[PDB]
Structures are given as structure tokens and as C-alpha cells.
Amino acid sequence: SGPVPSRARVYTDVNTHRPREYWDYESHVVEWGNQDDYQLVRKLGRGKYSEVFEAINITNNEKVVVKILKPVKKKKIKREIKILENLRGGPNIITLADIVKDPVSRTPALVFEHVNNTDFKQLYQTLTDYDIRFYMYEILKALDYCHSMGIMHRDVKPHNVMIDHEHRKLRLIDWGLAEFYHPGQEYNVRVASRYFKGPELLVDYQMYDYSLDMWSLGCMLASMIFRKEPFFHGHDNYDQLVRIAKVLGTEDLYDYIDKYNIELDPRFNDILGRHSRKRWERFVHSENQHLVSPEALDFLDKLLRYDHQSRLTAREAMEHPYFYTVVKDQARMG
Ligand SMILES: O=C(O)c1cccnc1
Numbered sequence: 245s246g247p248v249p250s251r252a253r254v255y256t257d258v259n260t261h262r263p264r265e266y267w268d269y270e271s272h273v274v275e276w277g278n279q280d281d282y283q284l285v286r287k288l289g290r291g292k293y294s295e296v297f298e299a300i301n302i303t304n305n306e307k308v309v310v311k312i313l314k315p316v317k318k319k320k321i322k323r324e325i326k327i328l329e330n331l332r333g334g335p336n337i338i339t340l341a342d343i344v345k346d347p348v349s350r351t352p353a354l355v356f357e358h359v360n361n362t363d364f365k366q367l368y369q370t371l372t373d374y375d376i377r378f379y380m381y382e383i384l385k386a387l388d389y390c391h392s393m394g395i396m397h398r399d400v401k402p403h404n405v406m407i408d409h410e411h412r413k414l415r416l417i418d419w420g421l422a423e424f425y426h427p428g429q430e431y432n433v434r435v436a437s438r439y440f441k442g443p444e445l446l447v448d449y450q451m452y453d454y455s456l457d458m459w460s461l462g463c464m465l466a467s468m469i470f471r472k473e474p475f476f477h478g479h480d481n482y483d484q485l486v487r488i489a490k491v492l493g494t495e496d497l498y499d500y501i502d503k504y505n506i507e508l509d510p511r512f513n514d515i516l517g518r519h520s521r522k523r524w525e526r527f528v529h530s531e532n533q534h535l536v537s538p539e540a541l542d543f544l545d546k547l548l549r550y551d552h553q554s555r556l557t558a559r560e561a562m563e564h565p566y567f568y569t570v571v572k573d574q575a576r577m578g
Contacts, residue, residue, distance in 0.1 A: 245505055245511075246505070247449060247450075247505050247506055247507075248504045248505045249451055249556050250449075250452070250453070250504070250552070250553065251426065251427050251428070251453070251459035252425060252427070252452045252453035252454055252455065253424065253455075253553060253557065254391065254454070254557050254559065255391050255392055255454065256425075256427050257395060257422065257427065258392065258393070258394040258425075259394040259424050259425060259426055260426075260427070261295070261364075263520055266330065266394075267326075267394065267424040267426075268321045269319070269323045269325070269326035269327075269424075270319050270322060271306065272322045272326045274322070274325060274343055274352070275340035275343060275511065276343060276344060276345060277343060277344050277355070278346040279345055279346060279347060279353070280302075280303075281301050281302060281303050281342070281344075282299050282300065282301055282302065282308065282310060282342075282344065282353075282355060283299060283300050283302050284297040284298075284299050284310060285297065285299050286298045286299055288309070292314070293313070293314055293316065293420050294312055294313055294314055294420070295311075295312050295314075296309060296310070296311045296312075297309065297310045297311075297312075299355070299359070306358075307358040308341060308342075308355050308356060308357065308358050308519070309355070309356040309357070309358055309359075309549060310354070310355050310356075311353065311354045311355075311356065312346050312349050312351060312353045313349075313351045313352045313353065313354065314351065315350075315351055317355065318547045319422075321352055322364045323422070323423065324354075324419050324420045324422070325340070325343060325354070326404045327395055327419050327422045327424075328419055329355070330338035330393060330395065331389070331390055331393060331395065331419075334386070334389040334390070334393070335385040335386060335389050336382050336383070336385050336386035336413065336414050336415055336416055337386055337389065337390070337416060338356050338357065338358060338359075338387075338406070338416065338417045338419075339356060339357040339415075339417040340354060340355070341356060341357055342354075342355035343355065344440070345492070347499070354405075356417070357415075359406040359407075359408050359413065359415050360408045360410075360411075361395070361407050361408055361409075362407060362408075362409050363405040363409070364405070364473075365399065365473075366548075367407060367409060367546070368402070368468060368471075368473055369471075371468060372534075372535075373537070373540075374569070375555055375572075376465070376468045376469060376535060376540075377567060377569070377570050378412065378570050378573075379405075379407060379414055380461075380468075380566075380567070381562065381570045381571070381574075382414040382467060383400075383405060383416065383461060383464075384461075384558045384561050385463065386400065386414075386415075386416040386560050387400070387416070387454075387457055387458075387558040388557075388558035388559045388562065390416075391454040391557070391558055392427075392559075393547050394424050394425055395422055395423070395424055395425070396422060396423055396424075396453065396454050396456060396457060397416065397419065397421070397422050397457050398421040398422055398423060398435040398436055398456060398457070399418055399420070399421040399422070399435065399436055399437060399440075399460075400416075400436070400440060400457050400460035400464065400503070401437050401439070401440045401460060401463075401464065402463055402464060402467070403418075403437075404416065404417050404418045405417070405464075407483065419428070421435045421436070425453055425454060428515065429451070430450035430451055431450050431451070431452055432450075433445040433448055433449075433450060435456075435467065436456070436460060436574075438461070438478060438480070438481060438484055439474035439475070439476055439477060439478065439484070440460040440463045440474070441460075441481065441484060442456045442457060442459035442460065442552065443459070443485065443488060443497070443500065443550045443552075444453075444459075444552050445481075446481055446482075446484055446485040447485070447500075447501065447506050447508060447509075448506070449504055449506055450510065452552060453523050453552065454550065454557070454558075455552040455553065455555050455557075457558075458552075458555040458556060458557070458558065458561070459547065459548065459549050459552070459555065461547060461561075462544055462547030462548040462555075463475050463476060463548070464542060465540075465544050465547065466527075466548065467545070468535065469535040469536050469544070470527045470532050470536070470541050471530070471532040471535070472527070472532075473484055473532055475489070476488050480510055482509075482512060482515060485497075485512070485516070486515050486516055486517070489516055489517070489519050490519050490522075491521075491522050492518075492522075492548065492549075492550060493519050493520050493521030493522070494516060494517065494518050494519045494520060495518070495521065495552050496521065496550050498551075499551075500550035500551050503551065524536075524541045524544065524545065525541075537566075539564070539565045539566040540566055542565075542566070543556075543561070543562070543564045543566040546561075546564075547561070
């Protein structure tokens with residue numbers, strides 16, 4: 245009685261068949277640019293894995309973003325570089341422009357294209373029903389692309405979606421937790437950010453896949469349409485699953501655990517309780533009702549499922565009625 249194995253329903257074997265060099269990032273030899281081409285202009289933020297600046301290319305006065313890598317294994321940096329290179333040019337994928345050796349930090353620095361974005365804490369307050377549909381669709385194009393390329397993002401969240409709203413321009417950023425999908429691999433569950441972690445991570449089911457990103461995306465959609473960011477606000481990873489269970493219910497949670505023969509951590513015992521599945525209408529109120537439609541709720545419901553195999557894929561999600569008018573709008577004659 246260990247856990248039952250799982251496979252991605254789509255894109256299962258896309259790496260199997262690639263040249264080894266595509267996915268074998270530990271063998272990757274970095275192409276270094278010239279650090280003296282860039283000057284830091286203003287700090288944007290700083291966290292566990294890097295400090296991030298707006299910067300300028302002083303050879304041509306172009307704005308860029310520089311992410312100075314904190315010290316980590318060479319393999320971790322190679323993974324992020326290789327993924328960025330493999331995905332470069334794909335729809336809504338941030339473009340890695342250069343890789344340099346930062347002299348002061350003694351570490352590599354990644355140079356990205358600049359997106360003039362609006363902080364999601366201000367932007368989300370202003371989004372219309374159409375805007376949510378449009379940007380959702382844009383994120384789905386990036387996720388279908390990366391999934392189709394054999395890569396899980398593993399950190400989908402609002403902070404990692406840059407939006408230049410006047411240009412209706414979106415880029416999926418921060419590929420530092422991303423990894424290649426290989427069928428049967430048991431992955432590290434210490435990925436994503438708490439509020440966006442899928443149930444698979446929270447119950448310690450390691451044989452997960454691209455579908456993790458679809459849970460995170462559902463969390464983002466809930467936060468948009470209901471004006472509640474983040475939607476599932478746990479205090480820690482255990483309470484995070486409790487928050488989910490108070491909405492999706494405990495019946496379906498325990499069904500999922502049974503199906504995969506998961507051994508549930510006993511710290512859950514005193515905390516998970518017994519909860520009915522709630523209707524999404526419980527979250528509707530006068531300030532969000534204009535964002536909520538039957539289509540939005542049907543789509544959300546098909547993302548936020550305990551069983552990772554039963555969530556929509558990105559490519560299926562793009563066909564949902566919620567997106568009909570966005571799809572029509574983007575069929576441009578050129
Ligand atoms: O990928 C990143 O971490 C990144 C990309 C562009 C801008 N800021 C951060």
C-alpha cells in the first residue's frame with residue numbers, strides 16, 4: 245500500500261523523445277554576455293532566490309530587467325536558463341535577453357525584456373469581466389505552450405504574471421521553480437507559493453504533472469472574479485488544505501486520497517474536520533457580481549478539482565465558452 249502512480253494526460257512523453265540535451269540542463273554550457281553593457285536603475289524587489297532591478301543597456305539605452313541570482317547550486321541556475329532558452333519566443337513567455345556574471349555578487353545575473361507592468365494589487369481592483377477573460381486566455385496560451393514543450397512552471401501566481409495593461413500585454417515570468425516532466429518521476433512537493441499550492445503538494449503526492457499549474461490558475465481566477473486575493477488564505481501548508489476543504493468539501497478530498505492511496509499526514513486529523521461542498525454563489529456579493537457568470541463558474545469549477553487528472557488541460561480550457569468572445573477578438577485579419 246504505497247501511493248498509486250499517475251501520469252499526465254497530455255504531453256506525457258514529449259521529453260522522452262527529445263534529444264537528451266533539451267532536458268539535461270546539468271550539461272548546459274551557459275552563453276555569457278558582457279556585464280558592462282548594463283547598469284542597474286532601481287530595485288524592484290528581493291526574495292529567497294534573487295534581487296531584481298530595472299536596468300538599462302547602456303550601449304543602446306534600452307530598458308531591461310536584471311535578476312541577480314542569490315548563491316545556489318550551478319544546476320539550479322542551469323535549469324532556469326535552459327528552460328528560458330527552450331521556451332524563448334513562445335506565446336506570452338518572458339524573453340531572456342542576456343546572461344552575465346555580476347561582479348559585485350559573484351553570481352550570474354539574468355537579463356530580461358522590460359514589461360511596463362501595473363502591480364496586480366492595484367490592477368486587479370480595476371479589471372472588468374472582459375479583462376479577466378482576456379488575461380486568463382493569455383496565461384493559458386503560455387501554459388499550453390510550456391506544457392507542450394515538456395515543462396511545468398510550478399509557481400503560477402499574480403506576482404509571476406506581468407501585465408502592461410494599456411497594451412493588453414502579458415508575460416509569464418519567474419521560471420526558477422520550473423522543471424521538465426518525465427513520466428513516473430517523483431517530484432519535490434516544495435514548489436509554488438502557499439496560496440497556489442495544489443492539493444497534491446499539500447498531501448505530499450509526488451508523482452504530479454502539468455496539472456499542478458491548472459490548480460494555481462484556478463486559484464487566480466477565483467481571486468479575480470470574486471475580488472478576494474488570494475482566494476484560499478491558509479496560515480501554513482496544513483491550514484491551506486483546510487481552507488480548500490471548507491470550499492470543495494471533505495467528501496471529495498477523502499475520495500481523492502482513497503483513489504491514490506495517499507497516506508495523509510496525521511497532523512491533518514485534528515484540523516480538516518467535516519465540510520460540505522459549497523456552491524460558488526456563496527462567494528458572490530454586490531462588489532463582484534458583475535464579474536461572475538455561469539460560464540465563469542463552470543470554468544472555475546473544472547480547474548479547482550482535487551484530482552489532478554480531472555482538471556482541464558490548458559488546451560481544453562482555451563475551448564471553454566467563457567473565452568468565446570476573446571477568441572473571436574483575437575482572430576485578426578492583420
Ligand atoms: O523571470 C523573472 O524572475 C523576471 C522576469 C522579468 C521581470 N522580473 C522578474
